[PDB]
Amino acid sequence: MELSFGARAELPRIHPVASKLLRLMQKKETNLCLSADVSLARELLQLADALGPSICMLKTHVDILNDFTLDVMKELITLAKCHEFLIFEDRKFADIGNTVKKQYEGGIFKIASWADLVNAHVVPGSGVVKGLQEVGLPLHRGCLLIAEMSSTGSLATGDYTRAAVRMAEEHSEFVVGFISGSRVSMKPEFLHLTPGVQLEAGGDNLGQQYNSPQEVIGKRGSDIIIVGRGIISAADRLEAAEMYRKAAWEAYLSRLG
Amino acid sequence: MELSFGARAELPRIHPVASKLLRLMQKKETNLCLSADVSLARELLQLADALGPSICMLKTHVDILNDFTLDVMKELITLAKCHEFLIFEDRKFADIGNTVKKQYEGGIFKIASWADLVNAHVVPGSGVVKGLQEVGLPLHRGCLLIAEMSSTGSLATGDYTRAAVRMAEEHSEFVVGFISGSRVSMKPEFLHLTPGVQLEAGGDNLGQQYNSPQEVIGKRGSDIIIVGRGIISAADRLEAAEMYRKAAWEAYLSRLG
Ligand SMILES: O=c1ccn([C@@H]2O[C@H](COP(=O)(O)O)[C@@H](O)[C@H]2O)c(=O)[nH]1
Ligand SMILES: O=c1ccn([C@@H]2O[C@H](COP(=O)(O)O)[C@@H](O)[C@H]2O)c(=O)[nH]1
Ligand code: PRO
Ligand code: PRO
């Protein structure tokens, strides 16, 4: 009884941000999230423009952008609207509720003003979600909970992963899914986004581990691949994005049957 | 065989940042860390100047500072040098090693350029520490690992806390201690810093829980109290800081015997 992305977009309990995402995934035949891990605004925007048609989502780390301004994020929103992708700031909020509400709305970055999606670690308990939702619910935003991590020695396993799923399922007005290595929720209203993805086997020298799009979408039942260096370090980032898009999309179609 | 802060500053395996901190704690009779949770640079600097003599450490969240510039952090360093306290940026690095190294050195904040101490969640595995230490070791910085949290539903318990202690004890060239609710390491070279502290019982409406300085320093064996709203929300922040300093210092003296 697995539903297409387009049908999941219409589920009764779907969050509007999840619905928008699932509809553009189906329309564009993409379940690829670009991890735009660059330090230059011009490179971020040139990647967003060229790869926009190939991606369902662009994931930022704006705290590594040497020339961040709010006007850069206005230009990124123009490209997201044009090419139809969501903006996901990978901030990993991980503090008490009272602190993360200020980190989400305020400071230099004003993340809530431009990010469709953010994510949170569940280690502080559900106050982290309650704090974010104070800002995010009025701004019609969504949140992903980090249920598993791709890195060597990850402690996001067993009862920790189960706690993340329970926390998501109890804050479904704001939480739209997970960062995970696999399907962790049986509820089709939740998105599964998986980092640690490359076409070739291996990892990096600081604990990153890679699995293929076929493994994580096809066998492990995730929805979306998050890809950084597999695209960003390639010479032709557009062709690299197209190879990742086709891999993730076909793995999804094959699983759907 | 408990040693004074001044004697712990001389331990063979002490990190130089921990030694500097322990010496100024002993000199100034303070084991209070101010949590300077304000949105205005002028309020941050006015608190740092007035409360500097009362504190061993000033903890920042620079991502909530509406008017952050690197020149604000230069002014904060001038006050830290004058009054003798360390600067601790409570960034909660919580990503794969390759990402956190860029978040620590780069972007708008250039955290490593001004923060004596930062902290990390252990959930990604030890790559988070390896990534930070690539930047922090050359800059002679230190790191705290988050072994426990003060908030309701915290998952930083049991085997998670034990994993944080093992990770600290295996990266002792860079890791100088813990954010914890209690003594979690038996090794006196490690600092224990405890947030969730107020003189009065209670909490907040977003999962914060408070314990007293006497409870966390005296009974639970921590070294340093981290205090935000108990000071910041008071009318006279200097007198509030002095009440917290005297509470934490006497609890330490009584335990030392
Ligand atoms: O468990 C996780 C959570 C997040 N990321 C993020 O996903 C991207 C992976 O990049 P890459 O290894 O594909 O270059 C990075 O931005 C990293 O911070 C992971 O790699 N693993
Ligand atoms: O387990 C933890 C870790 C960190 N903090 C931080 O310590 C301060 C506590 O502030 P307050 O509750 O004393 O105002 C805040 O900056 C918060 O982010 C906690 O409260 N609890
Ligand atoms: O792990 C493997 O053997 C295959 C080869 C490419 C990616 N996955
Ligand atoms: O918990 C209690 O009862 C005491 C009263 C002040 C703070 N601790």
Side-chain angles (χ1 to χ4, degrees):
Chain A
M1 16 87 282
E2 176 135 41
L3 292 175
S4 70
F5 294 139
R8 288 169 65 192
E10 301 191 353
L11 284 163
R13 295 183 61 81
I14 201 69
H15 191 282
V17 175
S19 179
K20 180 173 179 173
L21 176 61
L22 285 160
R23 287 183 342 249
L24 67 84
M25 289 162 67
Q26 190 72 61
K27 177 184 180 179
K28 295 171 62 177
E29 300 191 336
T30 180
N31 56 332
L32 169 63
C33 176
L34 175 66
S35 189
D37 290 332
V38 299
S39 62
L40 285 181
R42 173 167 289 281
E43 190 173 15
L44 170 62
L45 294 172
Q46 287 180 169
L47 284 167
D49 193 18
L51 276 58
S54 299
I55 67 183
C56 69
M57 190 181 296
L58 190 148
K59 186 180 77 64
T60 56
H61 286 298
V62 292
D63 65 327
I64 73 168
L65 198 61
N66 287 332
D67 52 1
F68 172 84
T69 74
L70 282 167
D71 283 355
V72 173
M73 312 316 293
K74 184 170 95 89
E75 293 293 352
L76 183 61
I77 288 166
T78 296
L79 293 171
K81 288 182 183 173
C82 171
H83 295 305
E84 296 193 81
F85 59 80
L86 293 196
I87 300 165
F88 166 24
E89 166 57 34
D90 187 3
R91 174 61 181 78
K92 298 186 157 65
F93 293 107
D95 214 318
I96 70 171
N98 192 68
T99 291
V100 299
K101 76 183 179 95
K102 299 170 176 265
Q103 294 178 316
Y104 184 28
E105 191 178 44
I108 294 293
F109 295 137
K110 298 193 186 270
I111 292 167
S113 74
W114 52 263
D116 300 290
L117 292 172
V118 292
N119 58 350
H121 281 298
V122 296
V123 63
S126 62
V128 69
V129 180
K130 305 215 193 57
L132 291 175
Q133 80 182 7
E134 287 212 339
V135 171
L137 285 173
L139 285 172
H140 286 66
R141 302 310 199 182
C143 190
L144 302 167
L145 300 186
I146 301 159
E148 300 177 325
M149 294 194 72
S150 59
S151 41
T152 302
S154 171
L155 303 177
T157 65
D159 290 349
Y160 185 105
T161 303
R162 287 186 274 278
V165 171
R166 173 182 95 152
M167 193 177 301
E169 294 180 354
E170 294 182 350
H171 295 83
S172 67
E173 289 305 308
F174 182 53
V175 175
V176 304
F178 304 96
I179 311 303
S180 60
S182 65
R183 184 175 303 202
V184 291
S185 174
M186 297 309 307
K187 296 186 185 293
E189 299 78 18
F190 293 89
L191 302 163
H192 294 99
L193 287 73
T194 300
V197 175
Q198 278 206 23
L199 295 182
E200 299 285 9
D204 76 6
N205 57 2
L206 289 172
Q208 179 64 304
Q209 307 176 283
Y210 293 118
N211 286 98
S212 69
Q214 184 177 86
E215 174 66 25
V216 307
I217 302 301
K219 306 291 199 307
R220 297 181 180 192
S222 192
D223 297 318
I224 289 162
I225 58 169
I226 296 168
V227 180
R229 282 167 285 181
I231 293 167
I232 300 295
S233 299
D236 180 353
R237 274 86 78 93
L238 176 56
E239 183 58 19
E242 279 291 297
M243 294 173 70
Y244 280 98
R245 180 188 67 78
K246 289 174 191 171
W249 189 257
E250 173 57 24
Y252 153 74
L253 289 181
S254 287
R255 171 192 97 208
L256 186 61
Chain B
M1 16 87 282
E2 176 135 41
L3 292 175
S4 70
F5 294 139
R8 288 169 65 192
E10 301 191 353
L11 284 163
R13 295 183 61 81
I14 201 69
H15 191 282
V17 175
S19 179
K20 180 173 179 173
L21 176 61
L22 285 160
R23 287 183 342 249
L24 67 84
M25 289 162 67
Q26 190 72 61
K27 177 184 180 179
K28 295 171 62 177
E29 300 191 336
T30 180
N31 56 332
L32 169 63
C33 176
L34 175 66
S35 189
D37 290 332
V38 299
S39 62
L40 285 181
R42 173 167 289 281
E43 190 173 15
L44 170 62
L45 294 172
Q46 287 180 169
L47 284 167
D49 193 18
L51 276 58
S54 299
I55 67 183
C56 69
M57 190 181 296
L58 190 148
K59 186 180 77 64
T60 56
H61 286 298
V62 292
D63 65 327
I64 73 168
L65 198 61
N66 287 332
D67 52 1
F68 172 84
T69 74
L70 282 167
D71 283 355
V72 173
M73 312 316 293
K74 184 170 95 89
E75 293 293 352
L76 183 61
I77 288 166
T78 296
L79 293 171
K81 288 182 183 173
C82 171
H83 295 305
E84 296 193 81
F85 59 80
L86 293 196
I87 300 165
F88 166 24
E89 166 57 34
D90 187 3
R91 174 61 181 78
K92 298 186 157 65
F93 293 107
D95 214 318
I96 70 171
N98 192 68
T99 291
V100 299
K101 76 183 179 95
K102 299 170 176 265
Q103 294 178 316
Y104 184 28
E105 191 178 44
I108 294 293
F109 295 137
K110 298 193 186 270
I111 292 167
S113 74
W114 52 263
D116 300 290
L117 292 172
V118 292
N119 58 350
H121 281 298
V122 296
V123 63
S126 62
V128 69
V129 180
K130 305 215 193 57
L132 291 175
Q133 80 182 7
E134 287 212 339
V135 171
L137 285 173
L139 285 172
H140 286 66
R141 302 310 199 182
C143 190
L144 302 167
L145 300 186
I146 301 159
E148 300 177 325
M149 294 194 72
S150 59
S151 41
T152 302
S154 171
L155 303 177
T157 65
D159 290 349
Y160 185 105
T161 303
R162 287 186 274 278
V165 171
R166 173 182 95 152
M167 193 177 301
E169 294 180 354
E170 294 182 350
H171 295 83
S172 67
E173 289 305 308
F174 182 53
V175 175
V176 304
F178 304 96
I179 311 303
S180 60
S182 65
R183 184 175 303 202
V184 291
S185 174
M186 297 309 307
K187 296 186 185 293
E189 299 78 18
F190 293 89
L191 302 163
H192 294 99
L193 287 73
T194 300
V197 175
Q198 278 206 23
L199 295 182
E200 299 285 9
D204 76 6
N205 57 2
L206 289 172
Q208 179 64 304
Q209 307 176 283
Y210 293 118
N211 286 98
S212 69
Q214 184 177 86
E215 174 66 25
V216 307
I217 302 301
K219 306 291 199 307
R220 297 181 180 192
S222 192
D223 297 318
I224 289 162
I225 58 169
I226 296 168
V227 180
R229 282 167 285 181
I231 293 167
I232 300 295
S233 299
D236 180 353
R237 274 86 78 93
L238 176 56
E239 183 58 19
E242 279 291 297
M243 294 173 70
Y244 280 98
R245 180 188 67 78
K246 289 174 191 171
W249 189 257
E250 173 57 24
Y252 153 74
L253 289 181
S254 287
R255 171 192 97 208
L256 186 61

